Amino acid sequence: MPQLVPFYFMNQLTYGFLLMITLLILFSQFFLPMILRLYVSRLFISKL
Amino acid sequence: MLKRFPTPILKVYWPFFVAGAAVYYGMSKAADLSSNT
Amino acid sequence: KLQFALPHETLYSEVTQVNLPAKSGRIGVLANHVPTVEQLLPGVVEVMEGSNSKKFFISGGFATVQPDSQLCVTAIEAPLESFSENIKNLLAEAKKNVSSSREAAEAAIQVEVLENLQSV
Amino acid sequence: ISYAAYLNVAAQAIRSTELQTASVLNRSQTDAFYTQYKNASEPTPITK
Amino acid sequence: DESILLLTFLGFTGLVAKYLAPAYKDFADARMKKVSDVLNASRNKHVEAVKD
Amino acid sequence: LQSTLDNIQSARPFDELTVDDLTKIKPEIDAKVEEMVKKGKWDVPGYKDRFGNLNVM
Amino acid sequence: MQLVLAAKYIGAGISTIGLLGAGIGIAIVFAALINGVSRNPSIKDTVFPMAILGFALSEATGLFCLMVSFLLLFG
Amino acid sequence: QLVLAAKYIGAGISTIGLLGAGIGIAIVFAALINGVSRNPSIKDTVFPMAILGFALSEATGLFCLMVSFLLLFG
Amino acid sequence: MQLVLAAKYIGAGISTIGLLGAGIGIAIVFAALINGVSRNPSIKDTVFPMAILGFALSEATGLFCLMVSFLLLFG
Amino acid sequence: MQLVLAAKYIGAGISTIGLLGAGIGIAIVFAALINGVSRNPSIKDTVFPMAILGFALSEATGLFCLMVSFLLLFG
Amino acid sequence: QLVLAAKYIGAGISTIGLLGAGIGIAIVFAALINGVSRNPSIKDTVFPMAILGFALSEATGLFCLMVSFLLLFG
Amino acid sequence: MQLVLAAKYIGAGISTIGLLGAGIGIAIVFAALINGVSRNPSIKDTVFPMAILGFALSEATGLFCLMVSFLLLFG
Amino acid sequence: LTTFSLYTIIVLLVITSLYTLTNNNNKIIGSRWLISQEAIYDTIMNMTKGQIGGKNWGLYFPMIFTLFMFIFIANLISMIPYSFALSAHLVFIISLSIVIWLGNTILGLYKHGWVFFSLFVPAGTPLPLVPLLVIIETLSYFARAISLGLRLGSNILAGHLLMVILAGLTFNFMLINLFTLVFGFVPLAMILAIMMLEFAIGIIQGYVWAILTASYLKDAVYLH
């Protein structure tokens, strides 16, 4: 099948790994602590 | 909305990253052998 | 048609659904069911006659579907809502009891019963 | 362990919610002494 | 060929709008309520302590 | 204490309220979150013992 | 010519083998029904729709198989 | 002739499909016996079930059999 | 080419055999449902989505066979 | 030459047979789950991870087989 | 050539062997779920042994697979 | 010659079939171990070495088969 | 134009919107869309607190989360009836799986020396069959290498290809006049049942990915 034999493997793989690393950093530093912030805030209000 | 909280996952995730660099090189050679189409 | 009984009381009784935790897993009985004898373990029980439900916490006993659709339930002492924070105090005691140790079986059973009540 | 001992203990354990009445406690508490016998010669009554 | 595939996807979104968009509304509602009730309850709770 | 009653009277959070205002009035919020981000934990026990835990499993 | 016609007649036969599985499957659903209903006769009224669903689905795997058999048999 | 050969060989292959139905029937009758021996009196309800189960099990085999005949005879 | 084309049609029939396993699989999940429900009654509300899931997953492995069969047969 | 291409498509058909076992396997894991749940409905939350593990692991052998099929077909 | 064709055929036949391992894995997990539903509590002892049993059932299938690659490439 | 070389590879492929029985086999022993241990909580001290013996023996049929596969393939 | 690159960008743009435009005022009661991303977070919090459950469960929770969300979104993108391969570019998924396997082997070696290989003696068993159980333990350890990637890749690719093949057949089915399309709804319904299923088998595969690479990480992090 032509779709599973390109030669563009490294071209693809470079942009592919760029999306992965972006999401990892993005989650880890930004969006994950903002969900945990909702949790802790809700509990802090729950305490108060 | 968003706030940056640093994650020092560099030293944590060091074996994951090492495998990626090696594979970057290795898939290049596999690609080079197939690109002699 | 249920026959539920205890020494001191002959609680409740026909009875449409009875849901039991037995050495057969959990069993629900509706009308005729196969005539079995089952060891009742300590249990959380629901008994329904129509959709009206009476809820029992049960000390284990015996269950026997009879061949005459008389569901003979025999138990010692129980309702789950009357029986239910002092169970948490008793939980601390039972853990302590396990610490010291037939005494082993006693303390183990106490932990089991505590878990079972804690479930509701 | 023995089945009737198992059920007995379960009933006894159940005799401990906070609303519990004396009669419940009595139905699962006894201080009797089984006067062990033999033959005549009777091993001493040990608390039941 | 691929317009048949789009008919299947269109059918897929039709089922979604029947069942899922109200269900997800109900799900979202359920959580919104639970959070709110805890929050407003806690606000009440400290006010009691003030009065005491 | 009259003032304390008045302060609850003039604000009753119940819909929304930016977490930034909560961080500004209590930077402890952001501190606890940050310590958790640093630790590699994400459990808030009271968000489980006095809020749900949204799991089908 | 002969090769294509041969391939059709052989290939049809081969397909038919898959169909045996569905036959056994159907029996398994019915067996469970009988045993289940034996254990509680009044579970029957709820269970009979569920049983027919399981039967139909097991049979369905057979339908797809049999279609492929006929496609090879009769083009 | 290759085409005629393919018919006779092909017929043999198709015959394999029937085996599942034969087994299927046995399973239904076994369940009948198990249910009946356990309950006794489930029987009057169960008897129409047993006949039905036989028929459906047989039917999947029957589809195999007609395919066998179609290839065999032509 | 007559050989290669014949080979496609034969190979298609071979893939069709695989369907027997899935057919039996569907029945096994539903048999468990019937037995469990007959024992407990009341479990069914939780269990019924799981039963459909079990059928679907067994079927899915079957579909992988089916796409090879159709890839040769039609394609 | 024709033999090679023929062999590719025949061989593809042949490999596909291996998958059937995994299809039954998945059903068996779900059957166990259903029976376990009906016998103790609270087992489910500890068991749910183990059930998913069993689905995947059973499936994996079949997908290895399928991958050889794809090596012939696409390759 | 016939030899090139032959390695493709041989690879196909060898792949079927995996079937048994897939069934094997499911049998270990079924017993795990049944045991744990009986006990509520057997699992801690059982789980290490169970992962060993899964691995071994799978391993047999991998022998089939390794023969397939040895045929196909070799 | 070409036919004989082919027959070596082909014979190896056919030979590989026997291994499937051992795959199922090891699992039946381990399943029984789980079942027994779940019944007793305590059969295990006898049963664990007994079970390892059962594994080794069930595996062996597959290994005899594998030996023949290698003899055909390489030889 | 590199289609694969364009759809990887599209995945990135979907994920940014899920914590921003989904969110509407940093609500303390929870925005209607954002309630989804609470539940996913919690059922994976309690899953990797379950699965590896260290004091560093959450330390590897971002890694397990971006493997969730990547697969979760890219099995929406691959489901569009006019969109190009991502996970069906098998080479990205399998490469990623082998990378994770190598990064587990290295982690196990790094953390537990060359006595990392003591992991592959499974249990106390008779000494003459101790080496055998190392061979077919190590064999199973890099079966995890290819199993994890190929499971997901095969499922997504095969599903879409099945639908497209059945769609192409139904093109020639509908090239037989409308009287055949009296009782001709059933192949369309079959593609529809598969279309419901293909999202399902991708989220199930995403869960299977993320539970299994928590279990493998349990093995790699905790020596015995």
Short mmCIF file of all heavy atoms in Angstrom, two decimals, chain L, unseen atoms left out:
data_model
loop_
_atom_site.label_atom_id
_atom_site.label_comp_id
_atom_site.label_asym_id
_atom_site.label_seq_id
_atom_site.Cartn_x
_atom_site.Cartn_y
_atom_site.Cartn_z
N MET L 1 14.80 -30.17 -6.35
CA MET L 1 15.76 -29.03 -6.26
C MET L 1 15.05 -27.83 -5.73
O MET L 1 14.99 -27.65 -4.51
N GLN L 2 14.41 -27.04 -6.63
CA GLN L 2 13.67 -25.83 -6.30
C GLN L 2 12.48 -26.22 -5.47
O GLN L 2 12.16 -25.57 -4.48
N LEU L 3 11.86 -27.35 -5.87
CA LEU L 3 10.73 -27.97 -5.24
C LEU L 3 11.10 -28.48 -3.87
O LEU L 3 10.33 -28.33 -2.93
N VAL L 4 12.31 -29.07 -3.71
CA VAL L 4 12.81 -29.57 -2.45
C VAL L 4 13.12 -28.44 -1.48
O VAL L 4 12.82 -28.54 -0.29
N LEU L 5 13.72 -27.33 -1.97
CA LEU L 5 14.08 -26.15 -1.20
C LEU L 5 12.85 -25.47 -0.68
O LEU L 5 12.77 -25.07 0.48
N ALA L 6 11.83 -25.38 -1.56
CA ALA L 6 10.51 -24.90 -1.27
C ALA L 6 9.88 -25.73 -0.20
O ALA L 6 9.32 -25.19 0.74
N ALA L 7 9.97 -27.08 -0.32
CA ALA L 7 9.40 -28.07 0.57
C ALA L 7 9.97 -28.01 1.96
O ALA L 7 9.26 -28.25 2.92
N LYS L 8 11.26 -27.65 2.09
CA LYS L 8 11.87 -27.38 3.37
C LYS L 8 11.20 -26.23 4.10
O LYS L 8 10.74 -26.40 5.23
N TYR L 9 11.01 -25.08 3.41
CA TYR L 9 10.37 -23.91 3.98
C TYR L 9 8.91 -24.12 4.30
O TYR L 9 8.41 -23.72 5.34
N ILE L 10 8.17 -24.76 3.35
CA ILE L 10 6.76 -25.07 3.42
C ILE L 10 6.46 -26.03 4.53
O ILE L 10 5.51 -25.84 5.29
N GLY L 11 7.31 -27.08 4.66
CA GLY L 11 7.18 -28.12 5.65
C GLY L 11 7.33 -27.54 7.03
O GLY L 11 6.62 -27.95 7.95
N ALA L 12 8.23 -26.54 7.17
CA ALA L 12 8.45 -25.81 8.40
C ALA L 12 7.23 -25.05 8.82
O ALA L 12 6.85 -25.09 9.99
N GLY L 13 6.56 -24.35 7.86
CA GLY L 13 5.37 -23.57 8.11
C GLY L 13 4.24 -24.40 8.66
O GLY L 13 3.63 -24.05 9.66
N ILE L 14 3.98 -25.56 8.00
CA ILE L 14 2.98 -26.56 8.37
C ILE L 14 3.25 -27.09 9.76
O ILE L 14 2.33 -27.29 10.55
N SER L 15 4.54 -27.31 10.09
CA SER L 15 4.97 -27.90 11.33
C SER L 15 4.62 -27.03 12.51
O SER L 15 4.32 -27.56 13.57
N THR L 16 4.70 -25.68 12.34
CA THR L 16 4.48 -24.64 13.34
C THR L 16 3.09 -24.67 13.96
O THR L 16 2.88 -24.11 15.03
N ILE L 17 2.11 -25.29 13.28
CA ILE L 17 0.75 -25.45 13.75
C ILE L 17 0.63 -26.08 15.12
O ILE L 17 -0.20 -25.64 15.92
N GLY L 18 1.42 -27.13 15.45
CA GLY L 18 1.30 -27.89 16.69
C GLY L 18 1.43 -27.08 17.98
O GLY L 18 0.87 -27.45 19.00
N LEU L 19 2.19 -25.96 17.93
CA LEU L 19 2.48 -25.04 19.01
C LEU L 19 1.26 -24.45 19.67
O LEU L 19 1.31 -24.15 20.86
N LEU L 20 0.15 -24.24 18.92
CA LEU L 20 -1.07 -23.65 19.42
C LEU L 20 -1.61 -24.37 20.63
O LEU L 20 -2.14 -23.74 21.54
N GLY L 21 -1.50 -25.72 20.67
CA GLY L 21 -2.04 -26.52 21.75
C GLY L 21 -1.38 -26.25 23.06
O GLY L 21 -2.04 -26.19 24.10
N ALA L 22 -0.05 -26.02 23.04
CA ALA L 22 0.74 -25.67 24.20
C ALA L 22 0.40 -24.29 24.72
O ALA L 22 0.44 -24.06 25.93
N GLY L 23 0.04 -23.33 23.83
CA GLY L 23 -0.35 -21.98 24.20
C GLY L 23 -1.56 -21.97 25.08
O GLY L 23 -1.57 -21.32 26.13
N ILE L 24 -2.59 -22.76 24.69
CA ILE L 24 -3.79 -22.97 25.46
C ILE L 24 -3.46 -23.72 26.74
O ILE L 24 -4.05 -23.48 27.79
N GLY L 25 -2.55 -24.72 26.62
CA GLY L 25 -2.20 -25.66 27.65
C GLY L 25 -1.67 -25.08 28.92
O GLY L 25 -2.15 -25.40 30.01
N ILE L 26 -0.68 -24.17 28.81
CA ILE L 26 -0.03 -23.54 29.95
C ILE L 26 -1.06 -22.80 30.75
O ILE L 26 -1.09 -22.87 31.98
N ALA L 27 -1.98 -22.11 30.04
CA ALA L 27 -3.06 -21.39 30.63
C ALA L 27 -4.02 -22.23 31.42
O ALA L 27 -4.49 -21.75 32.44
N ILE L 28 -4.37 -23.46 30.95
CA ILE L 28 -5.30 -24.32 31.68
C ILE L 28 -4.72 -24.68 33.03
O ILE L 28 -5.43 -24.70 34.03
N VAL L 29 -3.40 -24.96 33.09
CA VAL L 29 -2.73 -25.27 34.33
C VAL L 29 -2.78 -24.08 35.29
O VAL L 29 -3.16 -24.24 36.45
N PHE L 30 -2.45 -22.86 34.80
CA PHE L 30 -2.44 -21.66 35.61
C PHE L 30 -3.82 -21.24 36.06
O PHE L 30 -3.98 -20.72 37.16
N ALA L 31 -4.85 -21.47 35.24
CA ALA L 31 -6.23 -21.22 35.58
C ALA L 31 -6.68 -22.06 36.75
O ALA L 31 -7.38 -21.57 37.63
N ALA L 32 -6.28 -23.35 36.75
CA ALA L 32 -6.61 -24.32 37.75
C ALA L 32 -5.93 -24.00 39.04
O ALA L 32 -6.53 -24.14 40.10
N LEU L 33 -4.68 -23.49 38.97
CA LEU L 33 -3.93 -22.98 40.09
C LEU L 33 -4.69 -21.87 40.76
O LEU L 33 -4.90 -21.91 41.96
N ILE L 34 -5.17 -20.88 39.97
CA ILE L 34 -5.95 -19.76 40.46
C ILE L 34 -7.23 -20.22 41.11
O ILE L 34 -7.56 -19.76 42.20
N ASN L 35 -7.95 -21.16 40.47
CA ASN L 35 -9.21 -21.67 40.95
C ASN L 35 -9.04 -22.40 42.26
O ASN L 35 -9.81 -22.20 43.19
N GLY L 36 -8.01 -23.26 42.36
CA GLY L 36 -7.75 -24.05 43.53
C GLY L 36 -7.41 -23.22 44.72
O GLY L 36 -7.92 -23.43 45.81
N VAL L 37 -6.52 -22.24 44.50
CA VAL L 37 -6.06 -21.30 45.48
C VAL L 37 -7.17 -20.40 45.93
O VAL L 37 -7.20 -20.02 47.09
N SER L 38 -8.13 -20.05 45.04
CA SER L 38 -9.27 -19.23 45.40
C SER L 38 -10.24 -20.00 46.25
O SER L 38 -10.92 -19.42 47.09
N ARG L 39 -10.32 -21.34 46.07
CA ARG L 39 -11.16 -22.16 46.89
C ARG L 39 -10.63 -22.32 48.29
O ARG L 39 -11.36 -22.12 49.25
N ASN L 40 -9.34 -22.69 48.44
CA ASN L 40 -8.73 -22.96 49.72
C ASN L 40 -8.23 -21.76 50.47
O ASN L 40 -8.05 -21.88 51.68
N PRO L 41 -7.86 -20.68 49.79
CA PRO L 41 -6.75 -19.85 50.25
C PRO L 41 -5.44 -20.47 50.66
O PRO L 41 -4.63 -19.71 51.18
N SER L 42 -5.17 -21.79 50.50
CA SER L 42 -4.03 -22.33 51.21
C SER L 42 -3.56 -23.62 50.63
O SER L 42 -2.61 -24.21 51.14
N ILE L 43 -4.15 -24.05 49.50
CA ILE L 43 -3.71 -25.23 48.77
C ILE L 43 -2.32 -25.01 48.20
O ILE L 43 -1.59 -25.97 47.97
N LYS L 44 -1.95 -23.72 48.00
CA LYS L 44 -0.85 -23.19 47.23
C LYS L 44 0.49 -23.77 47.55
O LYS L 44 1.34 -23.85 46.67
N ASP L 45 0.76 -24.15 48.82
CA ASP L 45 2.09 -24.60 49.17
C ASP L 45 2.41 -25.91 48.49
O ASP L 45 3.53 -26.10 48.02
N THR L 46 1.41 -26.81 48.36
CA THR L 46 1.51 -27.99 47.53
C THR L 46 1.42 -27.64 46.07
O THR L 46 2.15 -28.15 45.23
N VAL L 47 0.41 -26.79 45.76
CA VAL L 47 -0.06 -26.56 44.42
C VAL L 47 0.84 -25.74 43.56
O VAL L 47 0.84 -25.93 42.35
N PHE L 48 1.65 -24.80 44.10
CA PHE L 48 2.54 -24.00 43.30
C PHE L 48 3.64 -24.82 42.65
O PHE L 48 3.78 -24.69 41.43
N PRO L 49 4.39 -25.72 43.30
CA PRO L 49 5.37 -26.54 42.62
C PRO L 49 4.73 -27.52 41.67
O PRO L 49 5.30 -27.80 40.62
N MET L 50 3.54 -28.05 42.04
CA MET L 50 2.74 -28.93 41.23
C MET L 50 2.34 -28.29 39.92
O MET L 50 2.37 -28.92 38.87
N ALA L 51 1.93 -27.00 39.98
CA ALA L 51 1.54 -26.18 38.86
C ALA L 51 2.66 -25.89 37.91
O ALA L 51 2.45 -25.87 36.70
N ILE L 52 3.89 -25.65 38.43
CA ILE L 52 5.05 -25.38 37.61
C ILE L 52 5.40 -26.60 36.79
O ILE L 52 5.78 -26.48 35.62
N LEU L 53 5.24 -27.81 37.38
CA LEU L 53 5.40 -29.07 36.69
C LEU L 53 4.43 -29.19 35.54
O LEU L 53 4.81 -29.55 34.43
N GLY L 54 3.14 -28.84 35.79
CA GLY L 54 2.10 -28.86 34.79
C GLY L 54 2.36 -27.94 33.63
O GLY L 54 2.10 -28.31 32.49
N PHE L 55 2.89 -26.72 33.91
CA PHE L 55 3.30 -25.76 32.90
C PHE L 55 4.36 -26.34 32.00
O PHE L 55 4.23 -26.27 30.77
N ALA L 56 5.41 -26.94 32.59
CA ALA L 56 6.57 -27.41 31.87
C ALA L 56 6.20 -28.49 30.89
O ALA L 56 6.68 -28.50 29.76
N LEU L 57 5.32 -29.41 31.33
CA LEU L 57 4.84 -30.53 30.57
C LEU L 57 3.94 -30.12 29.43
O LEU L 57 4.10 -30.62 28.32
N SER L 58 3.00 -29.18 29.67
CA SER L 58 2.11 -28.66 28.65
C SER L 58 2.85 -27.93 27.54
O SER L 58 2.52 -28.08 26.37
N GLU L 59 3.88 -27.13 27.92
CA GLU L 59 4.76 -26.38 27.03
C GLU L 59 5.52 -27.27 26.06
O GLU L 59 5.78 -26.89 24.92
N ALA L 60 5.95 -28.46 26.55
CA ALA L 60 6.82 -29.39 25.88
C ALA L 60 6.36 -29.87 24.52
O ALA L 60 7.18 -30.01 23.63
N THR L 61 5.04 -30.13 24.33
CA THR L 61 4.49 -30.56 23.05
C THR L 61 4.75 -29.55 21.95
O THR L 61 5.15 -29.91 20.85
N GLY L 62 4.59 -28.25 22.30
CA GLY L 62 4.89 -27.11 21.47
C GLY L 62 6.34 -27.08 21.12
O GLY L 62 6.70 -26.82 19.98
N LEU L 63 7.23 -27.38 22.10
CA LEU L 63 8.66 -27.36 21.88
C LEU L 63 9.12 -28.47 20.96
O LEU L 63 10.01 -28.24 20.15
N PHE L 64 8.53 -29.69 21.04
CA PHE L 64 8.83 -30.79 20.14
C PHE L 64 8.49 -30.40 18.73
O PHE L 64 9.24 -30.65 17.79
N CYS L 65 7.35 -29.70 18.59
CA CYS L 65 6.83 -29.19 17.35
C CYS L 65 7.75 -28.15 16.77
O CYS L 65 7.97 -28.13 15.56
N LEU L 66 8.27 -27.25 17.63
CA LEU L 66 9.16 -26.18 17.27
C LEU L 66 10.48 -26.71 16.78
O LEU L 66 11.03 -26.19 15.81
N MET L 67 10.98 -27.80 17.40
CA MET L 67 12.19 -28.49 17.00
C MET L 67 12.10 -28.99 15.59
O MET L 67 13.01 -28.78 14.79
N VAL L 68 10.96 -29.64 15.25
CA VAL L 68 10.68 -30.12 13.92
C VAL L 68 10.59 -28.98 12.93
O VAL L 68 11.07 -29.12 11.80
N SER L 69 10.01 -27.82 13.32
CA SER L 69 9.93 -26.63 12.50
C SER L 69 11.29 -26.12 12.10
O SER L 69 11.49 -25.75 10.95
N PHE L 70 12.25 -26.10 13.05
CA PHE L 70 13.61 -25.67 12.81
C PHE L 70 14.37 -26.63 11.94
O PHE L 70 15.13 -26.21 11.07
N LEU L 71 14.16 -27.96 12.13
CA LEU L 71 14.78 -28.98 11.31
C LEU L 71 14.36 -28.89 9.86
O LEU L 71 15.19 -29.05 8.97
N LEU L 72 13.07 -28.61 9.59
CA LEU L 72 12.54 -28.38 8.26
C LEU L 72 13.00 -27.09 7.63
O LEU L 72 13.28 -27.06 6.43
N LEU L 73 13.07 -25.99 8.41
CA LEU L 73 13.37 -24.67 7.91
C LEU L 73 14.82 -24.52 7.54
O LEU L 73 15.13 -24.10 6.42
N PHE L 74 15.72 -24.83 8.50
CA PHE L 74 17.15 -24.71 8.35
C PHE L 74 17.75 -25.87 7.62
O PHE L 74 18.67 -25.70 6.82
N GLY L 75 17.20 -27.09 7.85
CA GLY L 75 17.73 -28.30 7.26
C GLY L 75 17.11 -28.46 5.87
O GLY L 75 15.85 -28.50 5.78
#
